[model samples]
Target: GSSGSSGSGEKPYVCDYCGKAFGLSAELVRHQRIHTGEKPSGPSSG
Candidate 1:
């Protein structure tokens, strides 16, 4: 079967509100924060 990104080399993680595609899931999640109205407070940016 030809999935959307399994073998098509597509950017699998697509942001629901932004319509932007990312090769990495982490990138996708980070983008969602803007639309989701949530600030990211992680251990460190470093």
Candidate 2:
């Protein structure tokens, strides 16, 4: 996944909790670990 921008100003998928943007929605979905911890049938942290 892209860790940074080349000053391209093209990132559209932004995390609501962290405000970090990603190139794709799926990438952003994975990057949401810090907040949601959305594991597969794992224990909930919310």
Candidate 3:
């Protein structure tokens, strides 16, 4: 099973709304903020 893998070999998922690609679905969701001009505030923020 590929469950424990990092999923690095998988193709990135392209966002239809902004055309941004991400290695995982969760990453794509987080990346959507770039188009919306939304920023994450507080600790642990990238």
TM-scores for the candidates: 0.53, 0.52, 0.42
Select the stronger candidate by TM-score from 2 and 3. Answer: 2
Q: At residue 41, what lDDT does model 3 achieve?
A: 67
Q: In each prediction, how many residue pairs overlap at the backbone (N, C-alpha, C within less than 3 A)?
A: 0, 0, 0
How many backbone clashes are present in model 2? 0
lDDT of 2: 0.74
For this target, which candidate reaches the highest TM-score against the unseen true structure? 1
Local accuracy of candidate 2 as per-residue lDDT tens digits, 1-46: 6696467455888777868878989988877876755354876554
What would the TM-score be for candidate 3 when compared with the true structure?
0.42
How high is the CA lDDT of each candidate model? 0.71, 0.74, 0.67
As a TM-score, model 2 comes out at 0.52
Clashes of 1: 0
Model 1 steric clash pairs: none
Looking at model 2, the pairs that clash are none
lDDT (Cα, tens digit) per residue for candidate 3, span 1-28: 4557454553468887956557888898
Candidate 2: which stretches are off by over 4 Å?
A: 1-10, 38-46
> Which number leads on lDDT?
2
